[PDB]
Amino acid sequence: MEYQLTLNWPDFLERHWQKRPVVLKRGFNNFIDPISPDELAGLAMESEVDSRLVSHQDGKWQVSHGPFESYDHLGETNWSLLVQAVNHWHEPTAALMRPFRELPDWRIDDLMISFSVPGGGVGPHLDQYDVFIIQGTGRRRWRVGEKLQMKQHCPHPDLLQVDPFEAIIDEELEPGDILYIPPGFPHEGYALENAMNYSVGFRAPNTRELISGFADYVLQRELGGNYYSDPDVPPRAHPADVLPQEMDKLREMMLELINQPEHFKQWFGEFISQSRHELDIAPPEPPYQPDEIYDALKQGEVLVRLGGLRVLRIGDDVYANGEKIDSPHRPALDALASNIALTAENFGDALEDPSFLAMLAALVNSGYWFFE
Amino acid sequence: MEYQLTLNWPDFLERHWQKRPVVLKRGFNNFIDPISPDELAGLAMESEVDSRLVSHQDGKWQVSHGPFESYDHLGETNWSLLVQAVNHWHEPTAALMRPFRELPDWRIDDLMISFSVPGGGVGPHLDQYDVFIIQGTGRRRWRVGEKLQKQHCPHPDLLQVDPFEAIIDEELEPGDILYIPPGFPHEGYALENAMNYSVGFRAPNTRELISGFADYVLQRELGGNYYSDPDVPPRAHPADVLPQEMDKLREMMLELINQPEHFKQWFGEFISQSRHELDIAPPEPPYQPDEIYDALKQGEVLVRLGGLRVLRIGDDVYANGEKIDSPHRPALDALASNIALTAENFGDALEDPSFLAMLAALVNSGYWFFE
Ligand SMILES: [Mn+2]
Ligand SMILES: [Mn+2]
Ligand SMILES: [Mn+2]
Ligand SMILES: [Mn+2]
Secondary structure, three states: OOOOOOOOHHHHHHHOOOOOOEEEOOOOOOOOOOOOHHHHHHHHHOOOOOEEEEEEEOOEEEEEEOOOOOOOOOOOOOEEEEEOOHHHHOHHHHHHHHHHHHOOOOOEEEEEEEEEOOOOOOOOEOOOOOEEEEEOOOOEEEEEEOOOOOOOEEEEOOEEEOOOOOEEEEEEEOOOOEEEEOOOOOEEEEEOOOEEEEEEEEOOOEHHHHHHHHHHHHHHOOOOOOEOOOOOOOOOOOOOEEOHHHHHHHHHHHHHHHOOOOHHHHHHHHHHOOOOOOOOOOOOOOOOOHHHHHHHHHOOOOEEEOOOOOEEEEOOEEEEOOEEEOOOOHHHHHHHHHOOOEOHHHHOOHHHOHHHHHHHHHHHHOOOEEEO | OOOOEOOOHHHHHHHOOOOOOEEEOOOEOOOOOOOOHHHHHHHHOOOOOOEEEEEEEOOEEEEEEOOOOOOOOOOOOOEEEEEOOHHHOOHHHHOOOHHHHHOOOOOEEEEEEEEEOOOOEOOOEOOOOOEEEEEEOOOEEEEEOOOOOOOOOOOOOOOOOOOOOOOEEEEEOOOOEEEEOOOOOEEEEEOOOEEEEEEEEOOOEHHHHHHHHHHHHHHOOOOOOEOOOOOOOOOOOOOEOOHHHHHHHHHHHHHHHHOHHHHHHHHHHHHOOOOOOOOOOOOOOOOOHHHHHHHHHOOOOEEEOOOOOEEEEOOOEEEOOEEOOOOOHHHHHHHHHOOOEOHHHHHHHHHOHHHHHHHHHHHHHOOEEEO
């Protein structure tokens, strides 16, 4: 399908994003759910999918990790099924992501869907990331509190919650409504009628993850192999001392390495292009030869990107799922990065180059793009 | 005994250290060996001690590792035995380290001893570390090359090398010292039965700094702050990552690194650790603080465990991967400055109970022993 967002973007980015939560009423007009609770359940039965059941009985909370062989015995009440990264396994669901391209592809994460019977829900909780929560069929009561430091507690080892909060937002969401929550704002919501919620999640790294990742990149690629050297080595009163100048030199090594021109860009390119959830990956059973891709495309057949596969451009280099793609043909690479559903027109003269055709062949044979 | 290096130190550090290799003729006058070859073999058989044995049947070599038994077996000619960190074990060998205190404690590693029967040698190897090779008990032929300078390929470190043209070729007598910087290919082998005492040095490369610091960051779970973009910049293509964003991220990292306390503490814990296993046997019954106090004021002498690294950063003291929590700058400064302390070395600090409780804990860790 194709989904149309009624949001006013400049106003939102200016006043709201990464600042304050909002309820965007009728974000989607005449909202038609991309998927059904049944299709979602069947999808949760699959073993490659990350899914979980969260139920609560009076005070007690029970969290069960999927997949599942059974719809019984659950209840008419007080439970919810959560499925991560549906946009990987379902194309119509993947369509929901497109309207959010007004925000950077690299910051966006994936689409997680929850189905809840009345009373069903995940409880009050905090996130470290921005989220858009889209109301599907049914209705839920959503509550968001002010952003204040609060202790996280665990009703279950597998389930994070906070203490109940005074809501700065308390509302019932109709289908098509969207609730934007910046990180740090406690929120809770629960089904009134049988409900479907679509969370477009976002991702941002912290410093720990960055320095760790890059350290592993340096180790793996065997970089930064230059040793500390002191032909000028300074005198000292006490031989057990390590002088401030030496510490400074030592750290200056790390800073210098971090600032080496290609290395950081390349590492981050390989990192950020990787998905936090498992892709659906099925390399073409026989591999493709370059000229049947050439032919297929020229024959009118269309190339489409695997749902959830991240393609990002940093400078003149492109990165698809951890792998750097480097080609002299810019329009083609731009076509690969900024739109799914590619046709020969988007490639231009690139297909004539056997090198580009070879690369493209390797990308398709990898499962990253497939024919329609 | 207690060794006196005859060396012009200003001239060495100025013209030589980390620059050019030299043969220092009669680096030691009347050089008596700290240890006998059979004693060395006595250590070569041990569970904890790191040894190795290298033999060349011409054109081909064989290497075995410790512990050891039955040296016959075989060999008369053409083999060598090598033992790491002998100063961690044999106390008079650690005294051979004292003259090199003219160089920083943090850059010094340890002393390895190699006994080679005639023809015995390790082959033309290469190091990324500085080394002083002290000749004793017999003679060896040493040759040192010109340090070739492999574009963008990692240096293999200790991996073996080419039959170089020698900028240095000679035969060492007892007391002779061959200093080599990192990068200079070198080979040596025994003529008469030969003892070599190689005092080595250690430097971190950038990779080790970044890995260590990263691990430390994970452990204390620091840098928890998340990248945020209230102002997030517009772009032509939704798939693009702008330079200003890359700068945001990079500066997050640089900021974490330039936080002084964390880097300081981590490195203090990192550099105070030893590259080889120490001898650690805490007193079977411990000492009460009063026992320490008393015995210490009886004129007894505490000595730092051989090979144990104690280093000062700012005013902070680190002993074997751990900080020492304490005031009394003179006393801790003494703990780092002198191996073999006395009551006079501490002075006033002994009357503070909180101080000697700590010190007693140091002794009980096995980091200092009486003699
Ligand atoms: Mn309840
Ligand atoms: Mn072109
Ligand atoms: Mn000199
Ligand atoms: Mn060497």
